Amino acid sequence: GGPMGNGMNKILPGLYIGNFKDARDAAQLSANAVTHILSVHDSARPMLEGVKYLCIPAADSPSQNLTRHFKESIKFIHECRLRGESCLVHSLAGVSRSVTLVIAYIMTVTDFGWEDALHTVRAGRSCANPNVGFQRQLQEFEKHEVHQYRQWLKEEYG
Numbered sequence: 001g002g003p004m005g006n007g008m009n010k011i012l013p014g015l016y017i018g019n020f021k022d023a024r025d026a027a028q029l030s031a032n033a034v035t036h037i038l039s040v041h042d043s044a045r046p047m048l049e050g051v052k053y054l055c056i057p058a059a060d061s062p063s064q065n066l067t068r069h070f071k072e073s074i075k076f077i078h079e080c081r082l083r084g085e086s087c088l089v090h091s092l093a094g095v096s097r098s099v100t101l102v103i104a105y106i107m108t109v110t111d112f113g114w115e116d117a118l119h120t121v122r123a124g125r126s127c128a129n130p131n132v133g134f135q136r137q138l139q140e141f142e143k144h145e146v147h148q149y150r151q152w153l154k155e156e157y158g
């Protein structure tokens with residue numbers, strides 16, 4: 001689909017990943033019934049009408065901590081999806097920052113480790129490829145914390 005994808009892509013029902021242009025595209029947002037946007041990039045802030053935002057200023061760097069944003073991202077995504085609505089998670093390219101948060105979400109709502117969750121994302125968005133630092137954070141999450149996050153999900157929403 002090219003290095004910034006070909007348009008926003010459905011990953012699971014009610015969950016899409018795209019680039020910054022996709023996130024401003026009224027036609028795509030309308031077509032995909034997107035009512036929530038999780039913006040994770042340098043300059044993230046609410047932009048459009050008709051959309052609930054979660055904005056996480058973050059760099060696409062191994063020095064960027066995204067683990068500390070997993071819980072708020074998962075809550076935001078999950079509450080949207082439980083209401084039958086659709087969430088777009090976007091970054092600059094829809095390759096790394098956004099992909100990482102979606103992987104953490106998939107890992108929490110399935111029994112998948114990060115590699116199986118990445119496979120799931122790539123099936124919908126072929127350009128998905130978190131930076132090697134984000135891969136390490138996902139590996140640590142898999143080892144030490146995803147089990148607690150799964151239980152939290154069950155307790156809060158199950």
Ligand SMILES: O=[N+]([O-])c1ccc(OP(=O)(O)O)cc1
Pocket residue numbers: 041059060091092093094095096097098099
């Ligand atoms: O600068 N870059 O090469 C670069 C920037 C952003 C990238 O992906 P993003 O975190 O999804 O926006 C991926 C690569």
